[PDB]
Write a protein that binds this ligand. Structure first.
Ligand code: CLA
Ligand code: CLA
Ligand code: CLA
Ligand code: CLA
Ligand code: CLA
Ligand code: CLA
Ligand code: CLA
Ligand SMILES: CC(=CC=C/C(C)=C/C=C/C=C(C)/C=C/C=C(C)/C=C/C1=C(C)CCCC1(C)C)/C=C/C1=C(C)CCCC1(C)C
Ligand SMILES: CC(=CC=C/C(C)=C/C=C/C=C(C)\C=C\C=C(C)\C=C\C1=C(C)CCCC1(C)C)/C=C/C1=C(C)CCCC1(C)C
Ligand SMILES: CCCCCCCCCCCCO[C@H]1O[C@H](CO)[C@@H](O[C@H]2O[C@H](CO)[C@@H](O)[C@H](O)[C@H]2O)[C@H](O)[C@H]1O
Ligand SMILES: CC1=C(C/C=C(\C)CCC[C@H](C)CCC[C@@H](C)CCCC(C)C)C(=O)c2ccccc2C1=O
Ligand code: SF4
Ligand code: SF4
Lengths: 81, 730, 138, 161, 73
């Protein structure tokens, strides 16, 4: 919000867990203690489109994201062209 | 998998949860995998990453079709035998109105069983045995009862060849992965040696045993079970024992003959099923070719050859992987097999090949729409399976820079055109009709599009029809009539019960249906074409060959990102074709009865099932339920308490089942979840649910239970609508 | 173009990539290394070869030009590299910045993950009525 | 000389589409189209206006005088103008309020020539509102007018056959 | 000042249908008895309640908008 879908979980470990999703998610930002110690929910999200490939894999244990962003550029949908 | 490879048990795998990708069906319980298992049961991305077997399965689990087609046919020959009406009907055609099936009078049943001919209670037929069966250079009920077990023979045996494969330790690669000869064989001697062999048992025996049937008798007052050997003495009436000729060639004299054949064209006055004196010659004249033809050839060579400038460099090399595909060499086939079935559906109705058809109206249109839905249900397929290629089949990318890599090169292109094609059509191809309404309901005919208001004038004629029925005066030899009696020029006299075929006139109300077909055939194909083409990669998703050719929809983003894929292009392309065929049917009978079917009496004042109501009145697309749907169908909704009744009595269900599809077609998915729990809750209180985690439908399963229903609904609806307006007047 | 012909990533034709909206707005382009002459797969449907230069193909939009990876790392190589071209220069230094390979640690940059309160009982709906004085612009 | 130009996808780089085949860029066609607003902007849009207005003008006659609503007219105000001196008018401001998707507000006058143009970045826009006026103004006097030497021309007609 | 002479089940009236697309069968019912140019008759009730609370005479009647509108502003 403008890209606000929560995939968070609690492990935020990313080995045999989740990577998939065009650019958007440059994480591994180890918070001072959470097991395989890499955490949060995103990096700078003003770049790419609206997947839920975002979970599909590696837990969000609650929801999982999808489209919810509304304010929606174009670069933010393939088609501005 | 696992227990217990490999050398160490016979002991078969009955017991231990799962199999089919690898954090498989998991210990942990669920339901989805029970539609999994049946769906995709046949598939190949699992079983093994290695060709080999698969062709070793498909050449077996193939087999069990033939065997089946073979258990089938038997119960039809048996059926078309001792549940008789065939004996009765043949001494007595023009008269009967055939049966093979009959109930047993349990519960309500019996109403379904209603006097059909040679004196008995039963349910009719629109499946023209009793008419291949004319054939029987012999006749006899118990006889078909041999042809019948002759059937179950081929089966058990042509079904133990399927034990005698996969399960037996199998052939391998070379065997098919040398293709070198295959069609060499197939077309030469079977394609040939059948049509050939069929010749020998198509004048030997059949011709004579209806040469002197087309008159009277009661069978066995004709055609013994052996009689037709060496005895080349009854073959005396139907030409010479060659008299002084020896193995054709020329040093032959005709001061008065020219062997059987003596080519016909037209229609027996007394049995207008087209002449048989021909039917040998044409099958003979086939086989030869095949006989000569199946003698290529060994492979590339011929395709590794003709290229050009813009043409197909990759033409040359058009697939090593056409010995290494299937999914490819199936999809090609379906387009042909399929597209080569509904070409039947014409040459049939405008050229009957069996004794007593046309007169028999309902027993060859059933046909022309059954054959019609395969020459379509097999074509969307013939696309699906190419999509299945286009996505996956080969190992890597070894196939390169060719005819395809070409076509794709353009792709936002071949489908860029085709599109506008359709909106050009549609506007010229349907709103065309809507004019009429809006202006005939406005009402000013001066200006409609009538076969008479917009300028066309009491003639259609001068085109090519009129240079077909009239061509027996070219290089043409001849033989009274044409080729297909439905052509412009000459002749009338066809049949002495009811009618058969005659000219079939055109202009507009023939002009524009013929065009709606265009636009209907075209936008069908758009969606399959662009569908299979954009199979694997795109500028809505490029990371888009990453699972399979199904996948639900990539995800809420990009705007939509739902339908995409190509399971689904082969989901909304069925959706059309159901129309493609469903309106082509709607076409034929409204013609074929508005004109043609109808009837002679004195001065042969013709009296169609309908005095051509078509005229000025299909052009209005209401006329299509004024004159069609509300007109005919009055036989469906009158049909209660009768004999056929099973149609009206279907026509409510299946005219229900369709109106149940929309629920499967039109709805969400975590919906019936959100619901399936409220349920799952009430379940747990009594202690009655959890085990086998009950789950809603697999996004695309959901679409699977659309579509399939929408068709078996929306279709048998007319299968009923029909048989109910040809049985009984017409 | 030609009088300056500086190419690298072989192709020939195609009605696929780049068209009007990559001048009038933004541009997007990927670059890479490689061993010896090898035939690839392609975004936009087509398919060609490699060898070198910069190995610098230009691409329509950036979801398009990382899929060289979603297969173009099932074909060897550490190094593949896409930036952002404008019609004039910079800000948005796309695969530039710091480190690379989304799954390491130098810094933390953005992200956060929480909103105000965390995933916990937001049976609590939407609170205040949106009013210019209480920290809900984040 | 070659196999077909020095063999090329586009002007040059093959990562733009266009797939320059024939029907695209054969000197056979690309010259049948550049006294007009194909490659280069001749004089201003001013004049091209009426060869465009007019040519497209005397069209739309037998379309709505031989396919007219109750057709083949015996009214001396048809076989020509009648109404359709409506289309050009319903669309001679179907245009003007598209040249409101052009503003860019100037007055240079460079329809006279200087140094062998280019108009350079001539692609994209680089035709302001005070241009798109003098064209869709050429349009009205090209539309209405181009409708009358249609009409005015008696009609000596070739027929069916 | 008809239908209040006695409202026998024959085709009241809403308003005058006027479309240039109409054929000359402007003359055919569609064009309905009493009135001249074609019309389409009250299937709304209004016609039995502008009447059913009295409100009658065709010189006595032609208010309607006049009030309601010197209201609806
Ligand atoms: C030569 C042809 C033929 C062959 C051998 C195959 C073979 C195959 N097809 Mg295929 N296909 C064909 C023609 C053929 N197809 C045609 C004509 C079409 C167009 C409709 C398709 C559309 C198609 C699709 C979309 C898919 C396949 C897939 C497949 C693969 C999956 C097989 C499977 O699990 O059975 C599937 C059958 C069932 C699970 C049985 C359910 C049948 C239901 C719908 C009943 C039909 C209605 C009927 C009236 C009900 C019986 C009566 C009832 C009222 C009592 C397999 C390799 C699938 C794949 O993923 O590739 C690997 C993919 O799903 N096919
Ligand atoms: C969505 C649509 C809608 C539409 C288009 C209509 C249309 C219609 N309804 Mg209706 N209706 C609707 C929703 C709608 N209704 C709903 C939701 C209800 C349930 C509440 C009703 C209940 C209803 C009833 C009971 C009746 C109608 C009737 C009618 C018809 C009469 C014409 C009319 O309404 O003038 C409307 C007239 C006015 C708005 C002005 C009168 C209002 C008076 C009461 C104002 C009093 C204020 C006054 C000045 C205060 C005085 C103070 C001081 C002087 C002391 C008309 C067909 C009538 C009918 O049967 O026709 C045959 C009648 O039977 N409707
Ligand atoms: C015309 C159709 C037809 C034919 C010829 C086949 C043939 C085959 N199916 Mg099959 N199938 C069909 C329709 C058909 N199916 C339908 C409609 C479904 C519903 C989805 C399935 C679901 C299905 C599954 C899940 C499996 C098969 C399998 C098989 C193969 C196993 C043979 C065997 O193990 O022992 C033959 C055993 C007998 C003759 C014993 C008697 C049993 C009764 C039914 C008779 C065989 C190739 C198995 C397979 O993968 O092989 C390819 C597999 O397990 N099928
Ligand atoms: C092609 C199809 C197939 C179909 C759909 C049918 C359908 C039918 N057969 Mg049948 N049949 C078949 C193949 C088939 N048969 C074959 C291959 C044989 C040779 C073994 C038979 C031998 C046979 C006999 C002897 C009988 C039937 C009968 C029937 C009817 C009784 C219903 C029933 O079987 O269960 C209940 C039913 C209409 C019964 C009948 O005709 O009486 C009404 C009779 O019992 N069939
Ligand atoms: C593929 C073929 C089919 C088969 C299996 C047969 C088989 C036979 N035909 Mg024959 N026949 C056929 C098609 C066939 N025919 C066709 C299409 C025609 C006409 C175009 C004929 C015209 C014909 C005649 C005139 C005769 C036969 C005879 C025979 C029998 C012995 C001579 C012979 O043809 O071969 C075996 C080869 C030799 C004996 C040498 C044998 C039963 C003859 C017969 O009755 O028995 C001797 C003789 O009467 N046929
Ligand atoms: C793309 C390239 C190259 C080129 C430049 C051409 C050009 C042509 N081919 Mg062609 N052709 C090619 C490769 C090529 N072909 C290849 C590789 C094949 C085999 C796949 C063919 C098979 C072929 C056939 C069968 C025909 C042509 C014809 C033609 C001519 C069209 C007739 C015309 O315009 O005059 C007509 C002008 C009038 C004023 C009248 C045109 C000169 C046609 C031809 O021979 O001329 C009609 C003929 O249809 N070609
Ligand atoms: C019969 C009636 C009606 C009449 C009187 C005309 C008359 C005319 N049309 Mg025309 N037209 C009509 C209906 C009619 N049209 C309809 C219904 C359409 C549907 C599109 C057209 C589409 C049309 C086009 C596209 C053109 C004309 C052209 C012309 C004019 C040129 C005559 C010519 O052949 O060039 C003589 C050329 C030489 C001497 C050189 C001519 C004044 C133009 C034209 O004919 O130029 C060739 C232009 O071509 N018409
Ligand atoms: C073995 C044989 C044979 C044969 C023959 C044959 C081998 C024949 C066959 C034929 C085939 C056919 C004739 C086919 C048929 C088909 C069908 C009939 C089908 C139909 C259909 C269709 C149309 C489609 C689908 C469906 C159905 C199936 C219905 C023989 C051999 C031999 C030898 C060596 C020795 C000497 C003698 C001889 C003789 C020389
Ligand atoms: C209600 C019901 C039913 C209904 C039903 C309906 C209401 C409908 C149905 C339908 C079905 C169907 C329909 C199926 C089928 C079929 C068929 C056999 C087909 C065939 C065909 C073909 C071949 C192809 C196409 C065409 C046709 C379709 C013809 C039932 C109910 C019930 C109950 C109470 C409870 C218990 C159970 C029961 C007893 C069950
Ligand atoms: C249905 C709309 C009419 C438009 C098409 C009419 C043009 C041709 C005239 C009638 C066409 C039907 O053709 C029909 O003509 C005659 C009816 O008059 C019949 O005439 C038949 O009956 C008599 C018995 O010997 C004799 O006059 C003829 O020898 C014989 O051919 C024929 O059974 C048929 O050939
Ligand atoms: C209605 C509907 C459902 C709900 C449909 C369901 C749950 C159908 C499945 C019901 C099963 C088939 C009942 C099976 C139970 C019996 C087999 C068990 C008893 C055994 C017999 C003896 C009765 C979806 O799940 C769905 C999913 C995606 C898109 C659209 C829809 C949709 O429209
Ligand atoms: S839950 Fe997802 S991405 Fe979140 S922390 Fe784990 S894998 Fe990382
Ligand atoms: S889930 Fe969202 S952020 Fe993540 S990749 Fe998909 S679109 Fe990007």
């Amino acid at each position: 919000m403008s890209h606000s879908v929560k995939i968070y979980d609690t492990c935020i470990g990313c080995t045999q867990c989740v990577r998939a999703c065009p650019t958007d998610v440059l994480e591994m930002i180890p918070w001072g203690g959470c097991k395989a110690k890499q955490i949060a929910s995103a990096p700078r999200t003003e770049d790419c489109v609206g997947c839920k490939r975002c979970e599909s894999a590696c837990p969000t244990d609650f929801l999982s994201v999808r489209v919810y962003l509304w304010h929606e550029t174009t670069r933010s949908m393939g088609l501005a062209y | 998998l696992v227990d217990r490879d490999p050398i160490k048990t016979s002991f078969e795998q009955w017991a231990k949860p799962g199999h089919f990708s690898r954090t498989i069906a998991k210990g942990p319980d669920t339901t989805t995998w029970i539609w999994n298992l049946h769906a995709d049961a046949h598939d190949f991305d699992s079983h093994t990453s290695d060709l080999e077997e698969i062709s070793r399965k498909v050449f077996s689990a193939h087999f069990g079709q033939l065997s089946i087609i073979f258990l089938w046919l038997s119960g039809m020959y048996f059926h078309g035998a001792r549940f008789s009406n065939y004996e009765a009907w043949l001494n007595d055609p023009t008269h009967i109105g055939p049966s093979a099936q009959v109930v047993w009078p349990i519960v309500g049943q019996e109403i379904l069983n209603g006097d059909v001919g040679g004196g008995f209670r039963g349910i009719q037929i629109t499946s023209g045995f009793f008419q291949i069966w004319r054939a029987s250079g012999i006749t006899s009920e118990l006889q078909l009862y041999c042809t019948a077990i002759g059937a179950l023979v081929f089966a058990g045996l042509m079904l133990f060849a399927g034990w005698f494969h996969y399960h037996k330790a199998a052939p391998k690669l070379a065997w098919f992965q040398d293709v070198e000869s295959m069609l060499n064989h197939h077309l030469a001697g079977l394609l040939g040696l059948g049509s050939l062999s069929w010749a020998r048992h198509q004048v030997h025996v059949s011709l004579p045993i209806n040469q002197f049937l087309n008159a009277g008798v009661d069978p066995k007052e004709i055609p013994l079970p052996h009689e037709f050997i060496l005895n080349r003495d009854l073959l005396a009436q139907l030409y010479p024992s060659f008299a002084e000729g020896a193995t054709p060639f020329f040093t032959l004299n005709w001061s008065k003959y020219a062997d059987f054949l003596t080519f016909r064209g037209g229609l027996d006055p007394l049995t207008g099923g087209l002449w048989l004196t021909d039917i040998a010659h044409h099958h003979l004249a086939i086989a030869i070719l095949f006989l000569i033809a199946g003698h290529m050839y060994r492979i590339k060579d011929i395709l590794e050859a003709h290229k050009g400038p813009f043409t197909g460099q990759g033409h040359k090399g058009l697939y090593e992987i056409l010995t290494t595909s299937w999914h490819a060499q199936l999809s090609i086939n379906l387009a042909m097999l399929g597209s080569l079935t509904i070409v039947v559906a014409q040459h049939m109705y405008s050229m009957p090949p069996y004794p007593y058809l046309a007169t028999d109206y309902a027993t060859q249109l059933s046909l022309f729409t059954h054959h019609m839905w395969i020459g379509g249900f097999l074509i969307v397929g013939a696309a699906a399976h190419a999509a299945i290629f286009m996505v996956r089949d080969y190992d890597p990318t070894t196939r390169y820079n060719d005819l395809l890599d070409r076509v794709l090169r353009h792709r936002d292109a071949i489908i860029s055109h085709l599109n506008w094609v359709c909106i050009f059509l549609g506007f010229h191809s349907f709103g065309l009709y809507i004019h009429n309404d809006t202006m005939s309901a406005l009402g000013r005919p001066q200006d409609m599009f009538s076969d008479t208001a917009i300028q066309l004038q009491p003639v259609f004629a001068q085109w090519i029809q009129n240079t077909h029925a009239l061509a027996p005066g070219t290089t043409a030899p001849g033989a009274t009539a044409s080729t297909s009696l439905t052509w412009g020029g000459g002749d009338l006299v066809a049949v002495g019960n009811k009618v058969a075929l005659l000219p079939i006139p055109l202009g507009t109300a023939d002009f524009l249906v013929h065009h709606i077909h265009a636009f209907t055939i075209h936008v069908t194909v758009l969606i399959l074409l662009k569908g299979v083409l954009f199979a694997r990669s795109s500028r809505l998703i490029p990371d888009k060959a990453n699972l399979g050719f199904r996948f639900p929809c990539d995800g809420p983003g990009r705007g939509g990102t739902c339908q995409v894929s190509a399971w689904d292009h082969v989901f909304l392309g069925l959706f059309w074709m159901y129309n493609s065929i469903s309106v082509v049917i709607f076409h034929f009978s409204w013609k074929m009865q508005s004109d043609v079917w109808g009837t002679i009496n004195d001065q042969g004042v013709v009296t169609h099932i309908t005095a051509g109501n078509f005229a000025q009145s299909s052009i209005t697309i209401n006329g299509w339920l004024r004159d069609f749907l509300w007109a005919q169908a009055s036989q469906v909704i009158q049909s209660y308490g009768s004999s056929l009744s099973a149609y009206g009595l279907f026509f409510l269900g299946a005219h229900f089942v369709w109106a149940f599809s929309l629920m499967f077609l039109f709805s969400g998915r975590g919906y019936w979840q959100e619901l399936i729990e409220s349920i799952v809750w009430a379940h747990n209180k009594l202690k009655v649910a959890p085990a086998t985690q009950p789950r809603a439908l697999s996004i695309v399963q959901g679409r699977a239970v659309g579509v399939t229903h929408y068709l078996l609904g929306g279709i048998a609806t007319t299968w009923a609508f029909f048989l109910a307006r040809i049985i009984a007047v017409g | 173009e030609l009088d300056p012909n500086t190419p690298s990533p072989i192709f020939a034709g195609s009605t696929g990539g780049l068209l009007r909206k990559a001048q009038v707005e933004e541009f997007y382009v990927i670059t890479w290394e490689s061993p010896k002459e090898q035939i690839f797969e392609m975004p936009t449907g087509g398919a060609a070869i490699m060898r070198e230069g910069p190995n610098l193909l230009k691409l329509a939009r950036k979801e398009q030009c990382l899929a060289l990876g979603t297969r173009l790392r099932s074909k060897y190589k550490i190094k593949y590299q896409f930036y952002r071209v404008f019609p004039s220069g910079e800000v948005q230094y796309l695969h530039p910045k710091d480190g690379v390979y989304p799954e390491k640690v130098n810094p933390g940059r953005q992200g956060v993950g929480l909103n105000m309160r965390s995933i916990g009982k937001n049976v609590s709906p939407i609170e205040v009525k949106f009013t210019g004085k209480q920290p809900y612009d984040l | 000389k070659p196999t077909y130009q020095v063999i090329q996808p586009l002007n040059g780089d093959p990562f733009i589409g266009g797939l320059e085949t024939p029907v695209t860029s054969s000197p056979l066609i690309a010259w049948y189209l550049s006294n007009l607003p194909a490659y280069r902007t001749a004089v201003n849009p001013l004049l091209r206006g009426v060869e465009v207005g007019l040519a497209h003008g005397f069209l739309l006659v037998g379309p709505f005088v031989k396919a007219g609503p109750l057709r083949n007219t015996e009214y001396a105000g048809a076989a020509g103008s009648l109404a359709a001196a409506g289309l050009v008018v319903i669309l001679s401001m179907c245009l003007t309020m598209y040249g409101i998707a052009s503003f860019k507000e100037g007055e240079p006058s460079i329809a006279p020539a200087l140094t062998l143009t280019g108009r350079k970045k001539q692609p994209d826009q680089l035709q302001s509102a005070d241009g798109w006026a003098k064209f869709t103004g050429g349009f009205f006097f090209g539309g209405v007018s181009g409708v009358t030497w249609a009409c005015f021309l008696m009609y000596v007609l070739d027929l069916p056959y | 000042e008809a239908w209040v002479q006695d409202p026998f089940h024959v085709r009241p009236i809403a308003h005058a249908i006027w479309d240039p697309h109409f054929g000359q069968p402007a003359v055919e019912a569609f064009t309905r008895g009493g009135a001249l140019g074609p019309v389409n008759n009250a299937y709304s009730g209004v016609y039995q309640w502008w009447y059913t609370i009295g409100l009658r005479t065709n010189e006595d009647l032609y208010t309607g908008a006049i009030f309601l509108l010197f209201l609806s502003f």
